[PDB]
Structure 1
Amino acid sequence: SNLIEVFVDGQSVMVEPGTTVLQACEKVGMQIPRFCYHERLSVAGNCRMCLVEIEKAPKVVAACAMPVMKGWNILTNSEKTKKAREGVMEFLLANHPLDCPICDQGGECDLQDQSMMFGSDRSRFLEGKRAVEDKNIGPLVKTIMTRCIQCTRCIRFASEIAGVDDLGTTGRGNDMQVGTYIEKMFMSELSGNIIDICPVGALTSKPYAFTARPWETRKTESIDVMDAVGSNIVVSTRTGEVMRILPRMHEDINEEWISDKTRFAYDGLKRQRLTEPMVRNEKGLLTHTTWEDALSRVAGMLQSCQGNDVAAIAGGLVDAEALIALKDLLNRVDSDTLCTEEVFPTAGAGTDLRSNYLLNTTIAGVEEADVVLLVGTNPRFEAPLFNARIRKSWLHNDLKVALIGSPVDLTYRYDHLGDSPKILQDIASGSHPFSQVLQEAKKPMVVLGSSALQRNDGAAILAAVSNIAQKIRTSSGVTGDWKVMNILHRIASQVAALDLGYKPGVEAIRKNPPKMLFLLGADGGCVTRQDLPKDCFIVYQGHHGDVGAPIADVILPGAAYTEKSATYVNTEGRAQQTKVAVMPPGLAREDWKIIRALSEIAGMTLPYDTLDQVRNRLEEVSPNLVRYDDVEGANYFQQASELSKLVNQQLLADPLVPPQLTIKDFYMTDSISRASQTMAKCVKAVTE
């Protein structure tokens, strides 16, 4: 039943026809060494390391890109196989300079490992050793092209995933410079990913460059933040502190890639942090004190204050644990005006009813989709690995990607349909040459960006897109069961806050002014002191405060995301937990621990002591927030769309636009990216 036998060292194994020899050897366990093969890119054959002596033939053939004929016998440990490997390894190490002390991949080279485990023990080639003058590619990536072995892997990665096409081979003979001809600062998204593509020490990190060496660090589990998708991130840590991060692999989401903001964020994570709990002072100033004074002042004011005069804006990067602790505390006082950072609208019951506030499909599940329309967003600048997934589908099989909302720099020929909600109600009617493609295609997907939802067109666009979803779902017979419709997000803590059933947005504060409020990471222009009564009493709990810290009344130095065993949810409902990597500097306790100490000092209690009891209460409140690395999509789209008909709003005539549109707004408007200097370097490098 469509299986071909290969005799790897006499051991027979079944292989799907058409696949490579190397995947058969990796099926039985063998690693034929490789330099120009990679398990995400196209298969070029330029490194010659993958060779193997296939029997009954006088010629050694490659195994990176060999199709499998019927009934092979593969010798991976013969005589001339080893002679070919020693020969090719002796060829590679000729025009490669002696930099292994100063090269930035001492522990993580590839020439070193494969030269030990397959290469010769003596060298030759007394003269020669050419040298290529380096370039200046960008302030993010340090570049010495002398160590470049011309392996053509950055080129294939750029041209087939980045889509930028700014890298090339130049020349002949030994003189093949891999690079960029026009002295252009190569700046794009995913350019941070190219320093792990390059298998030798030729493309290294610029700010990291000479700060560690990868045997001293220890590696630690962690979860991506400031992106809605959550690649799996491994912190190489050192000195009771950090060194760097790397992307590690989840199969479904964010395969072997990461965002540049995540990869270069940690400079701002350790630059302007908060180590002192801080109280205002009689001149009007902000000084610091011990925890007893600060928590006693907050507890006395909290025992004095009840009613509908207590608010809690929790945005930025907050936990499931801190939000559970705050919901229990704020139930325990009397009542609430919890709020989140980004205003999500609730008119067709969007807080409950699991569909309309997560990504209903799978991020990996978009490959089987066929026609995707894309209402206002910018996937290159909003969770870029989602855009890399869409480009992966666009490059492997056929798609049809149309965009409604902005003319932007997407890399793969979106079909621009205009930018107004009149276009959206016009496709709701169906007067296009593209509605036919929708309702008579096979597998449809509609991706709604959350950034086009902060405006006053929120519930109307959401209900109309859900009517599109009901139209194409109840028509055309697809599949069942499979989902046209999904939304995405920008911040994972907002997704966890919507999962816990909170009030989204500061509309509850605009309807009801409070007298006491807890700012758990108030990033942007949510509230001011002019828009609030003069006895403010903000308790801002966070880390490297630059907004809210000028608006300070009581500062509590919360921990960061690398610094606590949190519980985060991506934009598709999968609950991923962070792990302890670096203890926070200063006093800097964990957030829910601070909240439970606050409830201790105030005249009340909380019925838990440990983080395992916190996660027990988490499974009590919402059941899928402890079943780690798991997905289950929602249902009941008929009930959702029939509940979307009560509040009959209007659709404005103004054109919409996402503010996440270019490089400067990709780099500025987040806390950890704002606190750094590497972001400022690349901002002034792109603008200048």
Structure 2
Amino acid sequence: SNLIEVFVDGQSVMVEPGTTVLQACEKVGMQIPRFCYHERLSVAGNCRMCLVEIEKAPKVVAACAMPVMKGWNILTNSEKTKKAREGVMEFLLANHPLDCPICDQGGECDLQDQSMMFGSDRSRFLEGKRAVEDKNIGPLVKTIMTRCIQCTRCIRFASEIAGVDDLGTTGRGNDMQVGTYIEKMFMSELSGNIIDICPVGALTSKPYAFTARPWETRKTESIDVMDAVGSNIVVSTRTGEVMRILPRMHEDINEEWISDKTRFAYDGLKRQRLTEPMVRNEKGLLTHTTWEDALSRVAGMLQSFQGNDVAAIAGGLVDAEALIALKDLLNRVDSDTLCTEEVFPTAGAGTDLRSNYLLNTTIAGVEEADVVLLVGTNPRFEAPLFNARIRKSWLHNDLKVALIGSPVDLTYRYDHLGDSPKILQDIASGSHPFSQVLQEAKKPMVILGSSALQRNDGAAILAAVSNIAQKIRTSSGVTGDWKVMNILHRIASQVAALDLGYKPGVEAIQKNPPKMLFLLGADGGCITRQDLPKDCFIVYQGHHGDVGAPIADVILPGAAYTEKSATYVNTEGRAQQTKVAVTPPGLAREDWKIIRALSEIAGMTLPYDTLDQVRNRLEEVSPNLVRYDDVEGANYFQQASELSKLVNQQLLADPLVPPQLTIKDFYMTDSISRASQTMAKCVKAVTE
């Protein structure tokens, strides 16, 4: 029933009508050598390093693009094929100048792990070698175009996925270059991700430029948290420091791609960092004290305050294991009134059943979706891999788009519907169209951000949008189940820091004057000391010094995201555990071990020591944070569809605007970005 049998090397194998040779001959475990073919991109024919030799026909075909018909005998290894693959890869070593001592790819390159195993032995040329000239693009991509085997794998990629169409092919005959005809610098997100593509050392990375060669490093898998989708990365360590990080080729989030910001941002990790505890002194004096000393300083001051006068707020990238040790401790003195730095407006939900609180249809849902409407966001610069997971699916099959407010530059043809909060309401019935289009849609989808949800009318738009999701879903509403309404965040650790049960939004401190706070947030400009009452002290906790290092009483260090085995969550509610790499500098220690040694020196002593006795506690307070990377079936927004209709609040009126516009604010945002000195190089190459 619709498959062919074809004998690869005298062995039968089944193949769907319309897979090429290469996708067949992979099924039995061989690599025809590859240059211009690559999975995620398109295919063209200009390497000519895969020549398979078909059986009984004098010509030699190419195994990249050509179907496979009723069974050939696909003969990989003979005295005919081996007459070609030896005869091409002596051509593309004609001009390839005598680098490899110093070509920074010199340990992985594919003019190297082909042309020993396959292909030639020595050379006959003997004189020649054009040398063209380089140029520059930006302060990332470093470009020596003397090399360029000219696969044209960097070019089919621009016009492809990251939608910026610039790079080109200029010339004829032996001479064609690649880089751009005019002087335009080429800069965007995901376009710092090229330098996985290029199979030889033409395009090599700037900050890393000359440091280590890749037989010495140590690949210890990890996870990147600056943002929603997370990643799967892999670090590297030479002497016990971080050198550079890659992607890890997960098959849903990060197809092969890692974003740019999560790549070049390791650089402000070792720059400006707080290596010790630092005592209080009364004046502007702030000094370093032995680790035993300033522990008790804040220990006793807990034996004073009680009830709501002591409240802690942690809004940042902090783990999901220092969101228990801190919660149970400050909640065993019965003082809570605690939230995160973020703002999630809540009415009848926002913790229970969550159902609206996380992105429902996963990233892998978009591939099937048909009609999409997203509002109040610029998805490009927040979760940059949810964007191009539209783009690739916007192409390769048809998909429709609409945005609400402030038409920005996206990469594909959308249309601005209207700009205001007051457009949402009239779409309940027919007006300002689609009118039936969301209605006739087989698998509708709607996406609200954390930028728009953060207004002062926020609890209205949450409830106004949910209606149109109810409006459709109550009709059929999809097929089928096919959940519809869903949200996306921009902040690193929240869906963990929230569905543990930590109330959203910083309000609970805004109503009263609690005396002793713990800042893990910490660098948002939300809570200041002016806003606080009198000098009664806040104790900063965290690794960096950005803002809130000076405004604070007694500070305590911590380990960043590469030094500790923690648990984050991405916006489908998976569980991904980053893994140790470097051991933290100086005296700093892990966060949830600085809680328990705050506890025992004070009155209560929490019921655990090792890690596994932390996650059992994580297992009581939540069941799914110990289920690593599985999306469990839940809808449960029917019962919250009605109950959140409880309050009647109506909107404001004012055109929606995202915080980020075109670029320059994408770089310096969270913490590590701000102190990363290379971002400080590519922020000033933007303004001018």
| TM-score (ref. length: structure 1) | 0.99
After superposition, the C-alpha distances for 1:238-284 in whole angstroms (9 at most, x for unaligned) are 21111110001111112100111101011111110110111121432
Distance in 2 (CA, whole Å) between partners of 1:573 and 1:121 is 54
Do the aligned residues in 2 keep the contact of 1:361 with 1:633 (CA within 8 Å)? no
Give the Cα–Cα distance (whole angstroms) in 2 for the partners of residues 671 and 633 of structure 1.
Answer: 35
User: Which structure has the highest helix share of the two?
Assistant: 1
Q: How many angstroms apart in 1 are the aligned matches of 2:397 and 2:348?
A: 36
Do 2:143 and 2:204's aligned partners in 1 also have CA atoms closer than 8 Å?
Answer: yes
Residue by residue over 1:153-180, the C-alpha shift from the partner in whole angstroms, topping out at 9 and shown as x without a partner, is 1111111111111101110112110111
Match of 2:339, SS? strand
Give me the whole-angstrom Cα distance separating, in 2, the residues matched to 1:14 and 1:370: 32
Q: CA deviation at 1:555?
A: 1.2
Cα deviation, residue 520, structure 1: 0.9
Return the offset for 1:477. 4.2
Query: For 1:8-30, what per-residue CA distance to the aligned partner results, in whole angstroms no more than 9, with x for missing partners?
Result: 11111101111111111111111
Instruction: Give, in whole Å, the separation in 2 of the partners of 1:232 and 1:147.
Output: 31
Structure 1 position 394, deviation (Å): 0.3
Alpha carbons of structure 1 residues 660 and 536: separation in structure 2 relative to 1, 3 Å: farther
Query: What SS does the corresponding residue of 2:356 show, helix, strand or coil?
Result: helix
Tell me if the contact between 1:562 and 1:581 (Cα under 8 Å) persists in the aligned partners.
yes
How far is 1:457 from its partner? 2.4
Deviations 1:406-453 (A, max 9, x none): 211100011111211111112123313312110012110101111111
Cα drift, residue 108 of structure 1 = 1.6
Contact (CA 8 Å) 1:451, 1:658: kept in 2 or not? yes
Q: Which runs of 4+ in 1 moved over 3 A?
A: none
Shift of residue 479, structure 1, vs aligned partner: 2.2
- Is the 1:356–1:487 contact (alpha carbons within 8 Å) kept by the matching residues of 2? yes
SS at match of 1:567: coil
SS in structure 1 at match of 2:372: strand
Query: 2:544 — aligned with what?
Result: 544
Show CA shifts across 1:479-510 (max 9, x none).
Answer: 22211211000123111111211111111111
Question: Equivalents in 2 of 1:553, 1:64: separation in Å?
Answer: 65
Q: Is the 8 A contact 1:231 1:249 kept in 2?
A: no
**8 A contact 2:96–2:129 mirrored in 1:** yes
Cα distance in 2 for partners of 1:311, 1:200 equals: 56
1:282 and 1:310 map into 2 onto residues whose CA distance is 21
Retained in 1: the 8 A contact 2:2–2:16? yes
Q: Given the superposition, is the C-alpha separation of residues 51 and 536 from structure 1 closer, same or farther in structure 2, using an over 3 Å criterion? A: farther
CA contact (8 A) 1:339 1:504 kept: yes
2: CA distance, partners of 1:227 / 1:497 = 14
Q: Kindly indicate whether the alpha-carbon contact (under 8 Å) linking 1:354 and 1:634 is maintained by their aligned counterparts in 2.
A: no
Retained in 1: the 8 A contact 2:356–2:487? Answer: yes
TM-superposed CA distance for 1:579, in Å, is 0.3
- What is the root-mean-square deviation of aligned Cα atoms in Å? 1.1
1:362-396 deviation per Cα after TM superposition (whole angstroms, max 9, x unaligned) = 10111111000011111111111100100011011
CA contact (8 A) 2:7 2:72 kept: yes
Farther-moved stretch of structure 1 (294-303 vs 477-486):
477-486
Verify the 8 A CA contact 1:134 1:144 in the aligned structure 2: yes
2:441 touches 2:478 (CA, 8 Å); kept in 1? Answer: no
- Matched position secondary structure for 2:169: strand
Is contact 1:144–1:203 with CA below 8 Å preserved after alignment?
yes
The answer on whether the counterparts of 1:5 and 1:12 sit within 8 Å (CA) in structure 2 is yes
Which moved further from structure 2: 280-289 or 114-123?
Answer: 280-289
Task: Give the whole-Å Cα distance in 2 for the aligned partners of 1:75 and 1:337.
Answer: 72
Per-residue deviation, 1:56 = 1.2
Contact 1:529 1:536 in 2 (8 A): no
Q: Is the Cα contact below 8 Å between 1:439 and 1:476 reproduced in 2? A: no
Kept after mapping to 2: 8 A contact 1:576/1:628: yes
CA contact (8 A) 1:220 1:236 kept: yes
Q: Please tell me whether residue 490 in structure 1 is matched to residue 480 in structure 2.
A: no
SS in 1 for 2:230: coil
Alpha-carbon offset, residue 335 of structure 1: 2.2
Give the SS at the match of 1:387: helix
CA shift, 1:148, in A, is 1.1
For 1:7, the equivalent position in structure 2 comes to 7
Distance in 2, Cα, partners of 1:435 & 1:112: 59
SS in 1 for 2:382: coil
CA distance in 1, matches of 2:381, 2:477: 34
Partner of 1:299: 299
1:634, distance to aligned residue in structure 2 (A): 2.7
Select between 490-499 and 219-228 the one with higher mean Cα deviation: 490-499
State which drifts further: 646-655 or 427-436.
Answer: 427-436
For the residues of structure 2 that align with 1:616 and 1:364, how far apart are their CA atoms? 31
- Name 1:656's counterpart in structure 2: 656
Task: Indicate conservation of the 8 Å contact 1:187/1:686, yes or no.
Answer: no
Aligned-pair distance for 1:565?
0.3
SS in 1 for 2:395: helix
Whole-angstrom CA distance in 2 between matches of 1:362 and 1:230 = 13
Report how far residue 611 of structure 1 moved: 0.6
Other structure's SS at 2:109 match: coil
SS for the counterpart of 1:74 is strand
| 1:468–1:633 Cα change, 3 Å | farther
- How many Å separate the matches in 2 of 1:405 and 1:625? 36
Q: Give the CA deviation at 1:465.
A: 1.1
Structure 1 match to 2:132: 132
Contact 1:150 1:176 in 2 (8 A): no
Give the 3-state SS of the residue equivalent to 1:225 in structure 2. coil
* Larger displacement relative to structure 2 (659-668 or 363-372): 659-668
> Can you list the C-alpha shifts for 1:280-311, whole angstroms capped at 9, x where unaligned?
21432211111111111111111121111111
Q: CA deviation at 1:119?
A: 1.8
Shift of the alpha carbon at 1:117? 1.1
Equivalent residues of 1:421, 1:652 under 8 A apart = yes
Identify the residue that residue 258 of structure 1 maps to in structure 2.
Answer: 258
Aligned 8 A contact 1:339 1:505 in 2? yes
In the aligned structure 2, how far is the partner of 1:282 from the partner of 1:368? 62
Q: Is the 8 A contact 2:155 2:167 kept in 1?
A: yes
- Displacement of 1:550 in angstroms is 2.0
Structure 2 gap ranges (5+): none
Q: Is the 8 A contact 1:357 1:498 kept in 2?
A: no
Moved more, 474-483 or 257-266: 474-483
Deviations 1:112-141 (A, max 9, x none): 001111021111111111111001011011
Q: Which residue of 2 aligns with 1:178?
A: 178
Within 1, Cα distance between the matches of 2:214 and 2:337? 48
Tell me the secondary structure at the aligned position of residue 632 of structure 2. Answer: coil
Residue 163 of structure 1 is matched in structure 2 by: 163
C-alpha separation in 1, matches of 2:579 and 2:642:
42
Structure-to-structure mapping, 1:177-576, within 5 angstroms? 177-576=177-576
Is the Cα contact below 8 Å between 2:376 and 2:449 reproduced in 1?
yes
2:130 and 2:475 map into 1 onto residues whose CA distance is 66
Q: Alpha-carbon deviation of 1:223?
A: 0.6
Shift of 1:549: 0.4
CA distance in 1, matches of 2:549, 2:586: 17
Q: 8 Å contact 2:427–2:433 — kept in the other structure? A: no
Task: State the distance in 2 between where 1:283 and 1:433 align.
Answer: 64
Does the C-alpha gap of structure 1 residues 671 and 619 become closer, same or farther in structure 2, counting only changes over 3 Å? same
User: 8 Å contact 2:356–2:485 — kept in the other structure?
Assistant: no
Secondary structure, aligned partner of 1:337: coil
Same amino acid, percent of matched pairs: 99
Match of 1:151 in 2: 151
2:227 and 2:39 map into 1 onto residues whose CA distance is: 25
Per-residue deviation, 1:535: 2.4
TM-score of the superposed pair, with normalisation by structure 2: 0.99
In 2: Cα distance, 1:347 partner to 1:452 partner: 16
Structure 1 residue 578, shift from structure 2 partner? 0.4
Tell me if structure 1 keeps the 8 A contact 2:142–2:206: yes
Deviations 1:170-194 (A, max 9, x none): 1011211011111111111111110
How far residue 201 of structure 1 moved from its aligned partner, in angstroms, is 0.6
Q: How many residues align?
A: 688
| Contact 1:492–1:571 under 8 Å retained in 2 | no
Summarize the Cα distance change of 1:254–1:129 in structure 2 as closer, same or farther, 3 Å threshold. same
Indicate conservation of the 8 Å contact 1:440/1:476, yes or no: no
CA contact (8 A) 2:340 2:521 kept: no
Deviation sequence 1:20-43 (CA, Å, 0-9, x none): 111111111111110111110001
- In the alignment, is the contact (CA less than 8 A) between 1:403 and 1:417 conserved in 2? yes
Unaligned 5+ runs, structure 1: none
Residue 633 of structure 1, CA deviation: 4.4
Whether the aligned pair in 2 keeps the contact of 1:52 and 1:74 (CA below 8 Å) is yes
